[PDB]
Design a protein around this ligand. Structure first.
Ligand SMILES: CCCCCCCCCCCCCCCCCC(=O)OC[C@H](CO)OC(=O)CCCCCCCCCCCCCCCCC
Ligand SMILES: CCCCCCCCCCCCCCCCCC(=O)OC[C@H](CO)OC(=O)CCCCCCCCCCCCCCCCC
Ligand SMILES: CCCCCCCCCO
Ligand SMILES: CCCCCCCCCO
Ligand SMILES: [K+]
Ligand SMILES: [K+]
Lengths: 103, 219, 105, 103, 105
C-alpha cells in the first residue's frame, strides 16, 4: 500500500462525502430562491455527480451565491479526485516500466 | 401512530400574537422539512413557509404578507410557527406537513383552527334529542344532539366514542351574536335503542371541555 | 412562481363512471406534480406522487398521468367515498404551489 | 519547494487572476449585443468558474467574438491549471515510490 | 429586446389597503427585475432590487415577489406619500429596458 494508491483511494472516499454533503448543502441553499430547480435531495445528488465529473448537462443549475459556491467545491473536489487517480495510474505504470529494464 | 400533532384551536384578538406547535413522531431524519399550510374557510390550500429542524433555516412565501416566524426544537421534535399582529383575514385553519425532501407531503396534521375575534371563550351547551311521544318509528330510529352557545369553533362530535359512524350527520355551525351553534344526528336500527346505549361525545378544544350525553327516550 | 390551474372547479359525474381531473402548469415541470384529497373538515391526503406513482394504502381506483404542463388524475368507476376536494401541487421550482382545487360530486 | 509545486501553486494564483479578469472582460464585451445574458459581473464570475472547470451548464454563454475569445482563454487557462496540478501530483507520487525502493 | 408590460396604467386604491403592481416580461428573466419610484417632478428611486430583495432606507411597507415572466410590487397598507409613478426594469438581457409605468392614486 504505497502513497499514490492511498491518496487515490482516500480521494474516492472523500469524493463520495462531497457528493452527499454537496447534495444536502445545495438544497439548503437553493430553497428560498424563486425559480430554483435544485430543491430536492435525489436530483441534487444526480446534479452533484454530473458536476464533479464536469459533464454538466444543464438540466440542473444553482442560482444562489452559496448554491454556486457549493458547486465550485464539488467541481474542484471532483477534478482533483479524478486527477489524483490519473497521477496514481502514472506512478504505477512508470514504476513497472523500470521493472522491464534495469531498475 | 399519529405522526403530526397540533392543538385543536387558538383564539386570538386583533393586534396580539400566537405560537402554534407541531409535535412530530415516527422517523425523524436530518433531511426532513416541516411545512405550514393556511386554509381559509371555503378556500383552498396556501403554502405559508418551510423549515428544516436539522439546520434551523426557514423559508417563507413572498407573494403574501409575511407575518410568520418559523422556529424548531430538535430536543422535543416540535416545530413552531409565530404569527404576529393578526386580523380577521388571518383567521383560518393552519395545517403542518412533513416533507422527506422529495417534494411531496407524505403526512399532514389535524390542523389548528385559529379564530380572530374580540369575543370570549364559551363552553358548549349539550342537549339530547329524543323523538316525541306520538312519533312513529319504522325499521330505523333517528336520534341527535344539540350543541350551542360556544365560541370559537370547532367542535368534535362523536357517537359512542367512535364505535358509531354509519348514519351520522354533523351539520355546519351557524353564527348568531358571537355564539356558534350546530347539531348532530345519528340513525340506528329501531331494534337497538334504548336497549343498547347511544351517547354523543362533544369536544370543544378551544376551552378544552369534552362532555358526554346519553340519549334516553322521553319519559 | 409556477401557477397551477384546475378546471373545471366543480366536476359532476354519475356513479360507477370514469372521472378525470385536470391540472395545468404555467410552465413545464416534468412529472413533479402531486395529487391530494381533502374531504369535509379533514386533512389533505396524498393520492398520487410524481404524476403517476401510486401510494400504498390508496385504493387502486385512483391513477395519474401527464408530463410537462398537462396532468390528469383519474378515478376508474367513482363511488360515494370519493366525494371530496382534489388539489394538485408542484415541486419543480421554489416555492411549492397548489392548485385552485376541484370539487367532485 | 521544488518546481512542480511552484508551478502548480503559480497556476492556481494565475487561474484566479484569469477568472477575475475574465469576468470583467466578458461583461465589457457582451454588453452592446442584443440578447446577451453575460452582462453583469457577479454571474460572469460564476460563468468563469464553470468555464475554467469545463462544466459548462449552458445557463450562461457568450455570443460575441471577443466574448467568446475571452472564454477560450478562460478554458485553456483552466484546463492547463487543473492539468498542471495533476502533473505535480504525479511527480510527487513518483518521487516517493523511489523512496519505497532503492533510490 | 425584452418587453415589460405594466397593467393597469392607473391603479386606484382606498387608504390603508394593500395594493399590488404588475410587471410582465415578454420572456423569462429569472428574478432580474428591479422596481423604482418617481414622484411629481422628482428623480427615480430604487425600491426593490432583484424581484424581492429590499433596499436600506426604503420603508418596510414595500415588498416584491415573482419569478420568470410575472412579477409583483406590493404595498401593505398604502398611504398618501406613496402616490407616484412606479416603473420596473430588467437586467437579464442587453439592453436594459423599462416598463410603461403605473400611476398610483
Ligand atoms: C469561487 C468564487 C465564486 C464563483 C461564483 C460566484 C457566484 C456569484 C453569484 O452567486 O451571483 C449571484 C448571487 C445571487 O444570490 O448574487 C451574489 O451575491 C453574487 C456576488 C458575488 C460576486 C462578486 C462580484 C464578482 C466580480 C468579478 C468581476 C469584477 C472584476 C472587475
Ligand atoms: C480561438 C479561436 C476562435 C474560436 C471562437 C471563434 C468565435 C467566432 C465568433 O465569435 O462568431 C460570431 C461573431 C459575432 O460577433 O462574429 C464573428 O466575428 C466570427 C468570425 C470569426 C470566425 C471566422 C470564420 C471561421 C471559419 C472557420 C471554418 C472555415 C474553414 C473553411
Ligand atoms: C461550499 C459549500 C458552502 C456551504 C453552504 C451551506 C448552505 C448555506 C445555507 O444558506
Ligand atoms: C481573450 C480576452 C480578450 C480581451 C477582450 C477585451 C474586451 C473587448 C471589448 O470589446
Ligand atoms: K457541459
Ligand atoms: K450543457
Amino acid at each position: 500500500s504505497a502513497l499514490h494508491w492511498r491518496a487515490a483511494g482516500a480521494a474516492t472516499v472523500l469524493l463520495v462525502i462531497v457528493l452527499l454533503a454537496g447534495s444536502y448543502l445545495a438544497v439548503l441553499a437553493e430553497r428560498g430562491a424563486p425559480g430554483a430547480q435544485l430543491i430536492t435531495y435525489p436530483r441534487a445528488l444526480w446534479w452533484a455527480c454530473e458536476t464533479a465529473t464536469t459533464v454538466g448537462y444543464g438540466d440542473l443549475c444553482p442560482v444562489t451565491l452559496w448554491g454556486r459556491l457549493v458547486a465550485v467545491v464539488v467541481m474542484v473536489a471532483g477534478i482533483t479526485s479524478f486527477g489524483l487517480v490519473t497521477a496514481a495510474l502514472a506512478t504505477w505504470f512508470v514504476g513497472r516500466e523500470q521493472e522491464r529494464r534495469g531498475h | 401512530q399519529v405522526q403530526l400533532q397540533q392543538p385543536g384551536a387558538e383564539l386570538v384578538k386583533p393586534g396580539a400574537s400566537v405560537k402554534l406547535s407541531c409535535k412530530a413522531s415516527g422517523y425523524t431524519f436530518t433531511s426532513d422539512w416541516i411545512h405550514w399550510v393556511k386554509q381559509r374557510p371555503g378556500h383552498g390550500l396556501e403554502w405559508i413557509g418551510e423549515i428544516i429542524p436539522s439546520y434551523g433555516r426557514a423559508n417563507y412565501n413572498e407573494k403574501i404578507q409575511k407575518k410568520a416566524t418559523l422556529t424548531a426544537d430538535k430536543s422535543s421534535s416540535t416545530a413552531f410557527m409565530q404569527l404576529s399582529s393578526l386580523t380577521s383575514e388571518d383567521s383560518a385553519v393552519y395545517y403542518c406537513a412533513r416533507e422527506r425532501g422529495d417534494g411531496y407531503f407524505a403526512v399532514w396534521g389535524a390542523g389548528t383552527t385559529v379564530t380572530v375575534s374580540s369575543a370570549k371563550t364559551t363552553p358548549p351547551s349539550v342537549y339530547p334529542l329524543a323523538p316525541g311521544s306520538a312519533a312513529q318509528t319504522n325499521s330505523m330510529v333517528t336520534l341527535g344532539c344539540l350543541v350551542k352557545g360556544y365560541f370559537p369553533e370547532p367542535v368534535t362530535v362523536t357517537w359512542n366514542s367512535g364505535s358509531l359512524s354509519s348514519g351520522v350527520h354533523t351539520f355546519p355551525a351557524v353564527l348568531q351574536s358571537d355564539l356558534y351553534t350546530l347539531s348532530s344526528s345519528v340513525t340506528v336500527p329501531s331494534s337497538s335503542w334504548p336497549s343498547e346505549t347511544v351517547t354523543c361525545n362533544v369536544a370543544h378544544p378551544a376551552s378544552s371541555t369534552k362532555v358526554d350525553k346519553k340519549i334516553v327516550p322521553r319519559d | 412562481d409556477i401557477l397551477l390551474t384546475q378546471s373545471p372547479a366543480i366536476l359532476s359525474v354519475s356513479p360507477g363512471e370514469r372521472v378525470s381531473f385536470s391540472c395545468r402548469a404555467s410552465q413545464s415541470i416534468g412529472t413533479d406534480i402531486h395529487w391530494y384529497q381533502q374531504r369535509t373538515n379533514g386533512s389533505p391526503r396524498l393520492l398520487i406522487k410524481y404524476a403517476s406513482e401510486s401510494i400504498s394504502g390508496i385504493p387502486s381506483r385512483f391513477s395519474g398521468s401527464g408530463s410537462g404542463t398537462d396532468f390528469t388524475l383519474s378515478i376508474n368507476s367513482v363511488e360515494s367515498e370519493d366525494i371530496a376536494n382534489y388539489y394538485c401541487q408542484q415541486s419543480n421550482r421554489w416555492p411549492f404551489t397548489f392548485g385552485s382545487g376541484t370539487k367532485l360530486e
